Design a protein around this ligand. Structure first.
Ligand SMILES: [Mg+2]
Ligand SMILES: [Mg+2]
Ligand SMILES: [Zn+2]
Ligand SMILES: [Zn+2]
Lengths: 589, 589
DNA sequence: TTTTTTTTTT
C-alpha cells in the first residue's frame, strides 16, 4: 500500500558496515560476481535503518518480500545487464530475526509471521519441481489455445486447473503443457526440537519445512540448523468436506544456517602455544580426575590421522579407540564428553543399537510397497566420530556388521534386490567391561578381554582401565567434591572453542610425514612385532594395522598442533602412547 | 432475569480470599502482566459468594460463559489497554465443580451438561490447528472476491465450504485463503478410568478429550488429571448417507487440573519437628513389621540427592536401591507402597517388562509405514521413581538395557535408521530373590546375589533380606493379625500429605554440602576403599559411584528434613546407613 | 522380506 522499494534500495546502498564499508553494496557486488541468486540481509540492520520497513518485513512478509526482491533484481540488472539471461529471479533472504520460537511452543498466533526455529534436521527428500506458473491448453476443436492459468497470480499450494477457459469462455478438457510451464526446485525436510528442549518424559516434536530454489540441499541430516520462514497449514485435500477441520503446520523457509572469522584468528593464536597439545588434552573431560592417557587418546581420536586415497585403493585415516575397564571408571562420562565436543559425532550403546541401525537399514516403505535404504549410525557419522558405549553388550553376530566400516569404511549391503555401498568413514570410540565385570588379574588377558582379534586389530589404541584403590583415593574424592560444589578448572579451553579448533584442524591441516618420522615408525614397528611374537596367547595381535596406527597417531599429533609436517617429536609422541597402550594390554617392551 | 456480568465483576473485584486478600483481582493482575488469556476460578468461591451465579455457571454454562468472558475482557482492557491488539478473547475456566461422573458410568442424559472426569491421561497428539472461520475466494474471470464463509457463525467440527458465492451469487470452485483465515490450537488426548474404577476382570475404558488454545500441552502422558468440560458426539464423516447412525462420545475440555497452597504451611510446620526424619521413616509402609533400615532407604530414594548439571557433563542426583531377599519378606508390598506414595512413579516386573519396554521401543506405525519412537518405563518416569520388582527374573541380556539409564540417565537408541536419546532421570528401586530362591548362608555371597558388578555398582544401597526365625516370630505374627483386624498406626503421616511433602521438598530444597560434611564423607570413602581392597572376592565393589552415593544420600537426609545445608548430622546418618548396607552384604568396619 | 518387536509359530 505504501511502497518501500526506494527505502530498501537506499538501505542497501548506504547502510554503512563496521568500518564504513557499505556492507550490502559489497554483498550485492560479490553476489553478481559469483552469479549467486540470493542476497542475505540481517534483520537488525533493517531495524537500524527503517523501523517501519522492518515491521513490514516481519509481519507483512508474504507481499512485502517479493517487492523488495523485484527492486533488488532491477538494481542488479542496472549494475550488470549480464545478470539477465543468466538469472531471472533473485531472493531477499532475511537472517537473524530477534526472537526465536521453541519448536514445541509455537501457537496459532505465530502463523503468517516471519519466525525462526532452532532444531536438528533429521530427514530430507530428493529434489522435486513445484509449478508456480502453469500453462494449460483447452482441448476443443475451436479453442486449442495455450494460456497461463494462474493469471495475475501464482499457483497455490494446492494444484488447481481452470473450469472455464479464459481465452474463449467454454468449459472442457484441459491438458498441461510442460514446455511453457515455470517450475522452482523444491525439497521437503523435517526438523525436530533440540534434545535439551524436550520436556521431561515426553518424545521430541517435529516440524516439516520446505526449501525451494538455492535453499535445496543446503544441510545434511544431523545438522543443527536455524530456519527462518513463515508458517502455514498443510493441505492434502481441503476442497472436499466430511469432517477433518484440522490441519498440520509447516514452515516455508527463506533462510537457514548451520552450526566465523575471528574464530580462525583465535584457533591460530591458540595453536601458537608451544604446549597447545597439553592444553587440549587437559581440556578433555575436565570434571574427571586423572586418566590422562585416555584423555590423550580420545583427543587424538578427535583429531585423527590423514586418509590416503589412491588410484586403486584407499587407506583409512580415522583413529579407533577401545577402552575396556572396570565399572565406574569414568568411561561413559568421557565418551559423553567427546560426543559433545566433537564437531560431528553420533552416540550409541551396544544394547541400544542393532546391526542395521549402526550401518544401514533396508526398510519396506508401506506406501509404494518398495524397499528403500536408510542411513544407520556409522553412515550418518561419515566425516565424524561414532561412539559405541557398552560395546561388550552388543551381540557378536550383530557387532561384526561394523568390521567393514571400521577398516574399509564402507557399509555394503545386498538385500531385497538392491546392492549398494555407503561411506562410513567414521572414527569409532568404544568402551566396555571385561568378561567378569571387573578385570581379573588372576586370569590371562585372553579370557578376560573377551573380544575377537579381528575387531581388536581394528582399534589403534586399546587401554585396560583397572580400578585399583591406592594412595590416589583421597585425591580422587577431593576432586569429585570440588566438582560437585561448582569449582570448575581454570586455564582450560572451553568446549565450544575446542570444538571450533578441532573442526578447523580437520578441515585444513593435512600433515605430511617426514623421513625421520618414517624411520622411527618403521623401527618401532619392527620392535613391536618382535615382542608380539613372544606372547602368542594374547588376543591383542600386532598386524600391519598397528603400523598404520602409528602413522595415523603421529599424523594426529601433528594435526593437533596444526603442524603441516609430522616431525620426530610427533613420531615419538605416537610411539610413547602406543607403548603405554601395549603396557596396559600386557606387553612389555 | 438478572444481568450476571455485574454480579461476576463484583465477585472478582470484591471477593476477599483467605486473609482478606482480594484473590481474583490479584489473579487478574498476574494474568494481565504475563499476558496469559485464561483466569482460573474455584467453584467453591463462586458458591460462597453467589449461589445463583454458581447455579447459572454449572447449569446454564452454554450461554452464561461467553457473556462473563466479555465482561472480564472489558475489565482487563480497562486495567491495561495494551491488552488490546494482543488477545481478543479471555477464558474463564471453572475448576473443581461438584458434578463428577466416573468415566465408565457416563450415559445419554449427561451429554451437553458441564461435568468433571477424574482419570489418567495416557496419549496426546502433536499440537494442530483447527480452522474456525475460513475465508474463501471465488475463482472465476468475473467474480474473484474474498469472503469469510462460516458467516454469522463458526466452522463446525466438520469442515464445510460454500456451494453459492455470497459476493456475486454464482456457484463454482472456492479457494481457501490461509492468509485471511482464523485458526485455533487443537490437541486430541485420551484419558482412561482410574485403576480403582476398573471393573473386575475387565479392561479399563477410554475417552477422547479435545483441548484447545491455552489448554494445549497442559498435562503429560502419565499425569492423573481432573478434566471439566461438556460431552458431545464424534463426527468423522456425517453429512453423507450410507448407514453409520452410531456415534462415539468425547469431551470438549474447558478446565483441567493435575494431581494447593496451605499445604506449604503444613509441610513447613511439619519440618520444624527436630525428629522429622524419624517420623517420615516410620510413615513408610506402616503395615510392615520391622525392616526399618529398608523403610529408611526407601524414604531416601523418595527424596533423592541433588543432581549436578555442569558445562560439560551432568552428575546423577537420584538414589537407586536394591533389595535382594528371601521369599515372603514384604519386598513387593513395600515397593507397592513407594509406588503409591511417590508423586510420580512407575511400577514394573522383571518378567513383565522388556528391554525395549523399560527404555524405548521402535514401533512401525502402520499408518505412515515408517519407524517411530515410543517412551518406555524409565523414560516415562523421568523426574520420578521407577520400581523394578522381581528384577532377578530379567534376562541379563535384557537387563543391561537399563545400565545407561541408571548412570547417565539417558536412553539412547540407534535402530531402523533413527538415532535418538531421551532423558531417563528416574531413580530405580528394585527387588529380587537370590540365585537359589532363598539366601543360602552355606554358599558365598558372589553366586548368591547373582548379579554383575556393573549393575551392582549402580545401586547406592543394596540390602540382603534374610528371613530367619527367632524371637521376632510371635511379635511379627501379632502385628500381622492386628493389621488384618484393622488397627492402624498412630503418630503417622497420612500417605496423601506425605506425598505432598515429598513433592515440595524435591521441588524447592537444594541442599549444599558444608566443609565438615565433605571431610567426613571423604574419610569414610577412603576407609571403604581400603576395606574393599581387603575383600577381593565379593561382587559388591567400591567404585567412585559409592562416593557419589554418599553425596546423594547425605544431600537426601538434609532434603528429608528440608535443611538447606548438609550438616555433620546428615553426613553421619548417611555414613551409618551405608555401613549397615555394607554389613548386610558382609563387610565389617 | 527385513526389521524391531511381542508374540504364536515353521
Ligand atoms: Mg558406562
Ligand atoms: Mg514379591
Ligand atoms: Zn477455450
Ligand atoms: Zn463469486
Amino acid at each position: 500500500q505504501i511502497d518501500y522499494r526506494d527505502v530498501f534500495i537506499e538501505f542497501l546502498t548506504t547502510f554503512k558496515g563496521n568500518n564504513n564499508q557499505n556492507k550490502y553494496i559489497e554483498r550485492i557486488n560479490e553476489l553478481v560476481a559469483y552469479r549467486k541468486k540470493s542476497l542475505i540481509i540481517e534483520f537488525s540492520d533493517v531495524l537500524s535503518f527503517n523501523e517501519n520497513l522492518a515491521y513490514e518485513i516481519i509481519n507483512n512478509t508474504k507481499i512485502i518480500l517479493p517487492i523488495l526482491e523485484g527492486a533488488l533484481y532491477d538494481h542488479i540488472l542496472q549494475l550488470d545487464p549480464t545478470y539477465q539471461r543468466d538469472i531471472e529471479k533473485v531472493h531477499v533472504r532475511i537472517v537473524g530475526i530477534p526472537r526465536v520460537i521453541e519448536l514445541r511452543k509455537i501457537r496459532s498466533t505465530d502463523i503468517g509471521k516471519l519466525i525462526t526455529i532452532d532444531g536438528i534436521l533429521v530427514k530430507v527428500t530428493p529434489v522435486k519441481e513445484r509449478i508456480y506458473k502453469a500453462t494449460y491448453k483447452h482441448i476443443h476443436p475451436d479453442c486449442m489455445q495455450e494460456f497461463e492459468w494462474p493469471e495475475d497470480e501464482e499457483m497455490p499450494e494446492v494444484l488447481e486447473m481452470p473450469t472455464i477457459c479464459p481465452k474463449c469462455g467454454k468449459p472442457g478438457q484441459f491438458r498441461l503443457i510442460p514446455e511453457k510451464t515455470k517450475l522452482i526446485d523444491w525439497q521437503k525436510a523435517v526438523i525436530q526440537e533440540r534434545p535439551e528442549e524436550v520436556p521431561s518424559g515426553q518424545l521430541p516434536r517435529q516440524l516439516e519445512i520446505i526449501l525451494e530454489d538455492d535453499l535445496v540441499d543446503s544441510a545434511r541430516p544431523g545438522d543443527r540448523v536455524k530456519v527462518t520462514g513463515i508458517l502455514d497449514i498443510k493441505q492434502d485435500s481441503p476442497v472436499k468436506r466430511g469432517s477433518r477441520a484440522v490441519f498440520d503446520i509447516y514452515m516455508k523457509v527463506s533462510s537457514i544456517e548451520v552450526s566465523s572469522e575471528e574464530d580462525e584468528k583465535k584457533i591460530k593464536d591458540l595453536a601458537k602455544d608451544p604446549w597447545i597439545r597439553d592444553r587440549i588434552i587437559s581440556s578433555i573431560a575436565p570434571s574427571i580426575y586423572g586418566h590422562w592417557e585416555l584423555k590423550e587418546a580420545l583427543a587424538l581420536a578427535l583429531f585423527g590421522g590423514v586418509p590416503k586415497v589412491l588410484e586403486d585403493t584407499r587407506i583409512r585415516g580415522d583413529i579407533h579407540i577401545l577402552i575396556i575397564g572396570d565399572p565406574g571408571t569414568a568411561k561413559s562420562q568421557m565418551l559423553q564428553f567427546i560426543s559433545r565436543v566433537a564437531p560431528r559425532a553420533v552416540y550409541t550403546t551396544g544394547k541400544g543399537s542393532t546391526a542395521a541401525g549402526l550401518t544401514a537399514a533396508v526398510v519396506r516403505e508401506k506406501g509404494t510397497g518398495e524397499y528403500y535404504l536408510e542411513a544407520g549410525a556409522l553412515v550418518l557419522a561419515d566425516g565424524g566420530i561414532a561412539v559405541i558405549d557398552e560395546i561388550d553388550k552388543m551381540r557378536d553376530e550383530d557387532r561384526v556388521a561394523i568390521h567393514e566400516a571400521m577398516e574399509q569404511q564402507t557399509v555394503s549391503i545386498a538385500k531385497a534386490g538392491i546392492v549398494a555401498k555407503l561411506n562410513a568413514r567414521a572414527a569409532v570410540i568404544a568402551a566396555g567391561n571385561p568378561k567378569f565385570g571387573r578385570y581379573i588379574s588372576e586370569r590371562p588377558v585372553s579370557d578376560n578381554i573377551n573380544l575377537p582379534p579381528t575387531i581388536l586389530s581394528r582399534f589403534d589404541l586399546i587401554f585396560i582401565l583397572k580400578d585399583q584403590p591406592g594412595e590416589q583415593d583421597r585425591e580422587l574424592a577431593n576432586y569429585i567434591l570440588d566438582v560437585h560444589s561448582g569449582k570448575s578448572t581454570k586455564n582450560i579451553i572451553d568446549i565450544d572453542t575446542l570444538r571450533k579448533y578441532i573442526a578447523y584442524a580437520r578441515k585444513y591441516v593435512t600433515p605430511k610425514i617426514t623421513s625421520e618420522a618414517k624411520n622411527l615408525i618403521t623401527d618401532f614397528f619392527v620392535e613391536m612385532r618382535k615382542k608380539s611374537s613372544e606372547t602368542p596367547d594374547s588376543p591383542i595381535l600386532i598386524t600391519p594395522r598397528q603400523l598404520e596406527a602409528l602413522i595415523r597417531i603421529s599424523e594426529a599429533y601433528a594435526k593437533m598442533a596444526l603442524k603441516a609436517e609430522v616431525t620426530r617429536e610427533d613420531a615419538e609422541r605416537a610411539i610413547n602412547i602406543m607403548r603405554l597402550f601395549l603396557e596396559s594390554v600386557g606387553v612389555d617392551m
